[PDB]
Design a protein around this ligand. Structure first.
Ligand code: 402
Ligand code: SF4
Ligand code: SF4
Ligand code: SF4
Ligand code: SF4
Ligand code: FES
Ligand SMILES: [Mg+2]
Length: 574
């Protein structure tokens, strides 16, 4: 093909869109509703407008290149068209960037600045209560910011295949929301927050828990524990212009100490706990020749997916609590026993890359003796905002260590944030358990990677079993519907709601499509975790010294007794 773009001649054999071809050839074309190789088919934003000679104005994001095309991307007709569209968007947009949580990384603002657009008449609502929905424990909607770009709808469609995020006709006007405009919690929504990640503006956010945390920190009698997820240490640096794939663990510890937190632990410890209980459970399931298959239960998005679509699998879920909830359970029991603290005065806070964790933490039965396992859950973005509000120079902070009692962890718990991590860790412990040995080769690279459905054959006590790793909720739906589950007899299956694992969680830092093109965010974030794994002395969860001490002195043997009594949680079908 011979393509003419801005007077420059190209000769290509590629069959792609004008947008992609221009992007690959250093030619600037703006875009808004185009994301995940999809645009808003019904009401296209037309920000990607270009002028094709002989045809007129077209949308470059969904228009294929053709030989003989003379394309103008910067003609004044194009520019005033785009500016017109952006102006129309401003007409329905509360343009107050000051107290906005997307102030420092908003695509729409950058478009407005770029094309110097102004609203015909400024959108300034007196009563935002009609536009705001905070009923959910995980998600919040602010339709004063919504551009109706449909990126959340699409993202929900491709990531989960639930379409829990829909276009709705709210008595006259088009909005986005859950079915029947109900609270997302009351629908088949997984609360995975991929819709948030896809949103270019502040229309979609996480349900804030920062006030819980602040009030806890300022409360004189409250002893505040904080523990961050595996993924957090490999992600938050992005929000401080430190780049991608930067390990900032120690900096996070220091910052958390400077935020006034009373105890600094780590969720990876709880991951090691989860591996203790669940590998014990898998070994005893193997010895009893059932029940098979056993699914992981550490992902609340997947748990909700089972509750809403496959309730018959609820009893197939591991009884072991998620790292978060099991850590929280241990923090209200074991920790006071080794600290002398009043359990009622303990306030446990987790830092998560996930929004569904908020819902999981606020489950009614996720407590004992009136004491919540987890009292508050803040996202990576929330912790970043908290650090910035305290004016803490994160990038320049020196490394510190976590409090050892419940802060030590192995590489097995370290790789949890990546797809296949839980599987690999669980195998590392189960193989050692069932064979009564301490094996040398512990790397299971077959369950790693970004393949949607991963399958492996493992040999435990010289008998072979089939394991599977489901990477994404849509892939769970594919795995079940296509009958792949019934092809062979699977024994242990990992399921994560977010593709790539927790490192691509709904509470993770937003990434400009600019870097989505240049950086493989999932692999780059996971690489930090695996790098931590290969550089750790202990790479098995049952070699965690602090954890071993905890079990020996307090819980006893995992999988049974008080361990099974309080560190486990089972879900019931209706
Ligand atoms: N609880 C828990 Fe997990 C652990 O450890 C996180 O904390 Fe994950 C991460 N990162 C999240 O959110 S949940 C699903 N299992 C894999 S990793
Ligand atoms: S969503 Fe973006 S453009 Fe709108 S107020 Fe917030 S920062 Fe400004
Ligand atoms: S909530 Fe965000 S992603 Fe969804 S339509 Fe509105 S602006 Fe677009
Ligand atoms: S939280 Fe997940 S399942 Fe729910 S609407 Fe958003 S993307 Fe869809
Ligand atoms: S994969 Fe991780 S971040 Fe995503 S919903 Fe599950 S627990 Fe949350
Ligand atoms: S980006 Fe092409 S129509 Fe929206
Ligand atoms: Mg399209």
């Amino acid at each position: 093909k011979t393509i003419i773009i801005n007077g420059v001649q190209f000769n290509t054999d590629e069959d792609t869109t004008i947008l992609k071809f221009a992007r690959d050839n250093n030619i600037d074309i703006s875009a808004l509703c185009f994301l995940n190789n999809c645009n808003n088919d019904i009401n296209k934003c037309e920000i990607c407008t270009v002028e094709v000679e002989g045809t007129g104005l077209v949308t470059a994001c969904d228009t294929l290149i053709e030989d003989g095309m003379i394309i103008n991307t910067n003609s004044d007709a194009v520019n005033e068209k785009i500016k017109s569209r952006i102006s129309q968007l401003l007409d329905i947009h509360e343009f107050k960037c000051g107290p906005c949580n997307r102030r420092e990384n908003c695509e729409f603002l950058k478009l407005v600045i770029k094309y110097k657009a102004r609203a015909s008449k400024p959108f300034l609502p007196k009563d935002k209560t009609e536009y705001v929905d905070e009923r959910s424990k995980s998600l919040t909607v602010d339709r004063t910011k919504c551009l109706l770009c449909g990126r959340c709808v699409n993202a929900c469609g491709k990531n989960t295949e639930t379409y829990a995020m829909k276009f709705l006709n709210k008595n006259g006007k088009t909005i986005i929301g859950a079915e029947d405009e109900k609270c997302f919690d009351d629908t088949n929504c997984l609360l995975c927050g991929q819709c948030i990640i896809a949103c270019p503006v502040a229309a979609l956010s996480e349900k804030s828990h920062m006030d819980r945390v602040k009030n806890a920190l300022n409360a004189p009698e409250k002893h505040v524990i904080v523990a961050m997820a595996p993924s957090v240490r490999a992600s938050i640096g992005e929000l401080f212009n430190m780049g991608f794939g930067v390990d900032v663990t120690g900096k996070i510890y220091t910052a958390l100490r400077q935020l006034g937190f009373d105890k600094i632990f780590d969720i990876n410890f709880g991951a090691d706990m989860t591996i203790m209980e669940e590998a014990t459970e898998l070994v005893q399931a193997i010895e009893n020749n059932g029940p098979f298959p056993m699914f992981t239960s550490c992902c609340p998005g997947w748990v909700r997916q089972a509750e809403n679509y496959y309730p018959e699998l609820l009893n197939n879920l591991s009884s072991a609590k998620s790292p978060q909830q099991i850590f929280g359970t241990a923090s209200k029991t074991y920790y006071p026993s080794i600290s002398g603290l009043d359990p009622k005065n303990v306030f446990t806070v987790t830092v998560m890359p996930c929004t569904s964790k908020k819902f999981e933490a606020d489950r009614p039965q996720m407590e004992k003796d009136g004491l919540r396992d987890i009292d508050a859950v803040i996202t990576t973005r929330e912790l970043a905002k908290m650090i910035k509000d305290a004016k803490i120079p994160f990038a320049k902070l020196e490394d510190s260590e976590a409090d050892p009692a419940m802060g030590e962890y192995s590489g097995a718990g370290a790789i949890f944030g990546a797809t296949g991590g839980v599987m690999e860790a669980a195998l590392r412990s189960a193989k050692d358990f069932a064979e009564n040995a301490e094996l040398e080769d512990i790397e299971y690279k077959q369950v790693r990677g970004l393949n949607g459905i991963k399958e492996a054959e493992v040999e435990i006590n010289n008998n072979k079993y089939n394991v599977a790793v489901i990477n994404g909720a849509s892939n769970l739906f594919k795995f079940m519907k296509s009958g792949m589950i019934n092809e062979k007899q699977y024994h242990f299956i990992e399921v994560m709601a977010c593709h790539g694992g927790c490192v691509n969680g709904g509470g993770q830092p937003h990434v400009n499509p600019k870097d989505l093109e240049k950086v493989d965010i999932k692999k780059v974030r996971a690489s930090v975790l695996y790098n931590q794994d290969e550089h750790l002395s202990k790479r098995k969860s049952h070699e965690n010294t602090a954890l071993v001490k905890m079990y020996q002195n307090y819980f006893g043997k995992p999988g049974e007794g008080r361990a099974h009594e309080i560190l486990h949680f089972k879900y019931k079908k209706s």
